[PDB]
C-alpha cells in the first residue's frame, strides 16, 4: 500500500545468486529489446484476438 | 446483511494475500566498442576466473540499452490487463464445456434412443413379411 | 476489533548486504515481465490463425461434395427449414 | 392446554436470551468495520493492475548504478505483468 567475503549471513543468498542472474540477463538482451519493440502492437493484437 | 455486502472486497483481498560462461550479445559489444574510451572495463575473465565487477558493469550497460528502448517504445509502461485475460480464458472454457455437453447429449442420449427405435422397426418389419412370404 | 486496530494504526561487517538483495529482486522481476509481454503477442497471433484455418478449410463432410464447415452447416440448416415449412403449410 | 403452552414459551425465552447476550457486541462494532474494510480493500485493489574490503567498496559503486538503472527502467506495473504469463498460456490451450 505504501509503494571469504565479509558479508552479513542474512544476505548470503542474494549475493550468491546475483551472478547467474546477471549473466542470464545479458545473454537475453536482444530478445528483451525485440519484446520491448512489440509493446506498441499489443492493443492491435488484443483486438484481433477478440474478433 | 453486512456479510453479504462485503463478499466482493474479500475476494480482492484474497487475491493479493494468496560455471559462469558469459556470451555477450553483438548489440552490447557494439555499445562497449563505441564507448570504449569512456568505459574503463577489465576483462570478464582474469587469471581464468570471473571478474564480478566487470559482469556488473556489463549488466549496467545492458540495462542502459534496455532503458533507452523502453523510453522509445514503452513511455507510459504497457499494462497487461490480467483481469481481462482471466475473463476471456474463463469464457472460452465455458464455450468448450457447452460443445462437449452438446456432443455427449447427441451421442449418449439422442442417437441411442433413435437407433433403438430404428432397430425395432427394422425387426418388426422383417418378421411381418417373413410371416407373409414364408421366406426372407 | 483486531482489524480495526491494525487499519487505524498501520493501513489508514560490510554495509553491502542490502544492495545485493535489492538488485537481485529487481532484476528478477524485470525478467518475468518481459517474458509475459512476449507470450501475449505470440498467443494472440496463434489464436487468429487457428480460427482462420477452420473457416477456410474444405472437407468431405457428407455425400460426394467437398465443402467448408460453414457451408455444409448452412446447407443442413436450409434443408430443415425447408422441411419445417412444408410441415406448416399442412 | 395452559400447562403445555407455558412450557413451550419458557423454552423460547431461554433460547432468545442466550442469543441476545452474544449478538449485542457484534452489531455495535459493525459499521466501523465495514467502512474500514471497504476502504482498505479498494486501496489494495488499485495496486494490482587487492584487499577484500576494497573490492566490496568498488563493487558497491557499480551496484549502486545498477540499482539506479533498475529503478528507472522498471514500470509501476511490472510485477502485475509478470503474473499474467500463466494465464495467457492457459487461454491458448483452451482455444
Curated annotation (Swiss-Prot), chain D:
Top-level taxon: Eukaryota
Subcellular location: Cytoplasm; Cytoplasm, Cytoskeleton, Microtubule organizing center, Centrosome; Cytoplasm, Cytoskeleton, Spindle; Cytoplasm, Cytoskeleton, Spindle pole
Function: Contributes to mitotic spindle assembly, maintenance of centrosome integrity and completion of cytokinesis as part of the HAUS augmin-like complex.
Record family assignment: Belongs to the HAUS8 family.
Subunit structure: Component of the HAUS augmin-like complex. The complex interacts with the gamma-tubulin ring complex and this interaction is required for spindle assembly. Associates with microtubules. The interaction with microtubules is strong during mitosis, while it is weak or absent during interphase. It is unclear whether this interaction is direct or indirect.
Name the record gives this protein: HAUS augmin-like complex subunit 8
Name of the coding gene: haus8
Amino acid at each position: 500500500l505504501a509503494q571469504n567475503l565479509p558479508i552479513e549471513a542474512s544476505y548470503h543468498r542474494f549475493t550468491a545468486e546475483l551472478l547467474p542472474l546477471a549473466v542470464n540477463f545479458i545473454e537475453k538482451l536482444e530478445i528483451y529489446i525485440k519484446t520491448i519493440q512489440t509493446i506498441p502492437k499489443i492493443p492491435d493484437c488484443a483486438s484481433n484476438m477478440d474478433n | 446483511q453486512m456479510l453479504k455486502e462485503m463478499e466482493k472486497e474479500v475476494d480482492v483481498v484474497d487475491a493479493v494475500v494468496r560455471n559462469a560462461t558469459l556470451n555477450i550479445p553483438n548489440l552490447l559489444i557494439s555499445r562497449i566498442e563505441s564507448e570504449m574510451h569512456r568505459l574503463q572495463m577489465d576483462n570478464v575473465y582474469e587469471a581464468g576466473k570471473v571478474n564480478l565487477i566487470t559482469v556488473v558493469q556489463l549488466l549496467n550497460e545492458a540495462l542502459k540499452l534496455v532503458s533507452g528502448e523502453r523510453s522509445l517504445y514503452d513511455c507510459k509502461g504497457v499494462r497487461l490487463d490480467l483481469q481481462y485475460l482471466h475473463g476471456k480464458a474463463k469464457f472460452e472454457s465455458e464455450v468448450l464445456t457447452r460443445l462437449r455437453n452438446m456432443r455427449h447429449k447427441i451421442k449418449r442420449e439422442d442417437l441411442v434412443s433413435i437407433e433403438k427405435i430404428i432397430a425395432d422397426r427394422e425387426r418388426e418389419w422383417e418378421r411381418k413379411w417373413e410371416k407373409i412370404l414364408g421366406k426372407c | 476489533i483486531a482489524f480495526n486496530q491494525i487499519y487505524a494504526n498501520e493501513f489508514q561487517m560490510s554495509p553491502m548486504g542490502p544492495f545485493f538483495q535489492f538488485v537481485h529482486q529487481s532484476l528478477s522481476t524485470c525478467f518475468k515481465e518481459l517474458e509475459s509481454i512476449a507470450q501475449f503477442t505470440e498467443t494472440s497471433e496463434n489464436i487468429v490463425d487457428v480460427v482462420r484455418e477452420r473457416h477456410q478449410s474444405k472437407e468431405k463432410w457428407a455425400g460426394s461434395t467437398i465443402s467448408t464447415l460453414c457451408e455444409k452447416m448452412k446447407e443442413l440448416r436450409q434443408s430443415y427449414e425447408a422441411f419445417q415449412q412444408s410441415s406448416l403449410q399442412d | 392446554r395452559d400447562l403445555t403452552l407455558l412450557q413451550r414459551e419458557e423454552r423460547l425465552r431461554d433460547l432468545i436470551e442466550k442469543q441476545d447476550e452474544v449478538l449485542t457486541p457484534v452489531v455495535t462494532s459493525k459499521d466501523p468495520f465495514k467502512d474500514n474494510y471497504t476502504t482498505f480493500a479498494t486501496a489494495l485493489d488499485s495496486t494490482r493492475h587487492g584487499n577484500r574490503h576494497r573490492y566490496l567498496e568498488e563493487l558497491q559503486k557499480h551496484l549502486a548504478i545498477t540499482k539506479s538503472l533498475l529503478e528507472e527502467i522498471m514500470p509501476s506495473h511490472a510485477s502485475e505483468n509478470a503474473e499474467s504469463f500463466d494465464t495467457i498460456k492457459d487461454l491458448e490451450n483452451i482455444v
